[PDB]
From Swiss-Prot, chains A, B:
GO terms for molecular function: ferric iron binding; ferroxidase activity; heme binding; identical protein binding; iron ion binding; iron ion sequestering activity; oxidoreductase activity; protein homodimerization activity. The keyword Ribonucleoprotein does not apply. The lineage of its organism: Bacteria, Pseudomonadati, Pseudomonadota, Gammaproteobacteria, Enterobacterales. PROSITE patterns: BACTERIOFERRITIN (PS00549), FERRITIN_LIKE (PS50905). InterPro entries: Bacterioferritin (IPR002024), Ferritin-like (IPR012347), Ferritin-like_diiron (IPR009040), Ferritin-like_SF (IPR009078), Ferritin_DPS_dom (IPR008331). This is Bacterioferritin. The gene is bfr. It is an enzyme of class 1 (oxidoreductase). The internal surface iron site that binds iron 3 is important for the mineralization phase but not for Fe(2+) binding and oxidation at the ferroxidase center.
Amino acid sequence: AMKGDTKVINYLNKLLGNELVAINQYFLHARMFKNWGLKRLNDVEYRESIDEMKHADRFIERILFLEGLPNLQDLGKLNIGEDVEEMLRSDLALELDGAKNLREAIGYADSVRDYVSRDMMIEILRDEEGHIDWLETELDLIQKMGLQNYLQAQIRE
Amino acid sequence: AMKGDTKVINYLNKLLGNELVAINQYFLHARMFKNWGLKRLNDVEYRESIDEMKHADRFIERILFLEGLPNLQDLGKLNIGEDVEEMLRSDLALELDGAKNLREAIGYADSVRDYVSRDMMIEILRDEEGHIDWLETELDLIQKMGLQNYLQAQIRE
Ligand SMILES: [Zn+2]
Ligand SMILES: [Zn+2]
Ligand SMILES: [Zn+2]
Ligand SMILES: [Zn+2]
Ligand SMILES: [Zn+2]
Ligand SMILES: [Zn+2]
Ligand SMILES: [Zn+2]
Ligand SMILES: [Zn+2]
């Protein structure tokens, strides 16, 4: 029961849209992984999709508490990718942009004393840095091994 | 293990994108309803969101079976709406466009003897006509009652 900063609400709406794009992209990648028998990749995607759903729910709850309404930007075109490397590299692109947006939002909410919105986003950003670390690590392994050797290494004994 | 019609795959990708837009919009509406204490509205949304997730999964599975890959169009801007009538009227707009697209796809898959894709979409279209009926009925009740009386009538004894 309070009216929040108008720029804070706009940030929260931008960030919510980011989470929804990521969840859509996870929906497609999971099924693609599963079809190729890539169970370890599928299980990480699935698990991170749960993280993002939790973030979106937090955003919407915060917007509603601030007497704002959910109102999304153009969510654009997804770049789903055609092979595993491209899929993970697209995910990394989304994640790095989302983290950039989160930092910007955090700086601004902090600057205007919206410390509840700030603290929620800080928690979310910690989750996203974990997502980034995972992607970077996998992509570095694909570069080291070559994609086909990497994929062959996912096959279960 | 077969290669499907290229236009059939493009239809399936278009229709999949439709389902993802609808699921995003359900995610936002559910939480908005829940916040306003509109439990009956929230429960229908939630339940239909489950239908749409099932449809998207069918589409992706069919695309993968046809040796296609998931590849989405611009999913655009959602019109979330600012009051209950606007929210339901936006849902009706999505649903009517999605049903139009499904009929078009059904006619074409039938015309090229892709009767498995045709039959899957027919099943999906039956679900969507149910969604439409529900929306139209609620919207007719809002017109009859006025929105405020309608909303007051949702309140639980
Ligand atoms: Zn992914
Ligand atoms: Zn997230
Ligand atoms: Zn993430
Ligand atoms: Zn490379
Ligand atoms: Zn809705
Ligand atoms: Zn559907
Ligand atoms: Zn529907
Ligand atoms: Zn009206």
